[PDB]
Amino acid sequence: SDILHPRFSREDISQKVKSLALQISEDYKKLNPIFICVLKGGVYFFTDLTREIPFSVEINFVQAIELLKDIDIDLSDRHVIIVEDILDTGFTLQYLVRHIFTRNPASLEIVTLLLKEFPVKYIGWRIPDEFLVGYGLDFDGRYRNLPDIHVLEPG
Amino acid sequence: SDILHPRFSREDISQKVKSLALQISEDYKKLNPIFICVLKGGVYFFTDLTREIPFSVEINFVQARKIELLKDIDIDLSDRHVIIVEDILDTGFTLQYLVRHIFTRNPASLEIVTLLLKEEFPVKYIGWRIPDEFLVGYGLDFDGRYRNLPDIHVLEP
To answer: A148 is in which domain, residue-wise?
Structure first.
């Protein structure tokens, strides 16, 4: 039987997302940025974050090493931000980063809600090596849609 | 010189999403449903809705640009209870292709939930019926603009 323990409540996440959106907004205010959502896990964070940026942004989606869904827009001379729910090994991410740089963007930075212990400029929480679920993170397809994040002790 | 006027606040949307999720949760409690997000406009509604379903659901994504599928369903839908999630339905042309495409995969059932429905296949879950007006925000854009507003507004272009 799986055991879920509290970790980050909806409110903790909401406050952290607000904070990251403020840093981002203030750095990209005049840069007409493009936010890239890494499916499927980044989607909850992505919608919460982009909503808190108080000016129009362009959104795009990618999913994975090969790409199942690639970038469908011209990134040349655009300021790009990759949005991730979590970063651990960074293998998929390095592929995206390298792939996006070939399209000659004006710049590229990454925001991740969680970073397990290329530079990552915006970081929500640095976390130890633990099994987290919820808010986009799943365990064999389960718990992906929990509104909050929990520590999982697999059954 | 675009002019935006209030229409649906974050709170109105949150309340409507919660009521739709409650009906959906009861109807799909034991059906191990698959929720299909229609990108790009359905994404805000999709995350808000699926979050309020208090049991694990499977999520998947499709996107259309003649019809160009930039992203198709990446899972077996045979004998699965499927729900297509849309921010808005107007003409339903892309939607009709999706519906017909999904039915060839033999799902146990297929229903649609749309936050907005502008006044052929039935739409079982509907947030608000709206008159013919130009709305932006919460996934709806005007030439790529305003897509990420947290609320929905009426636009005078």
So the answer is: 1-155
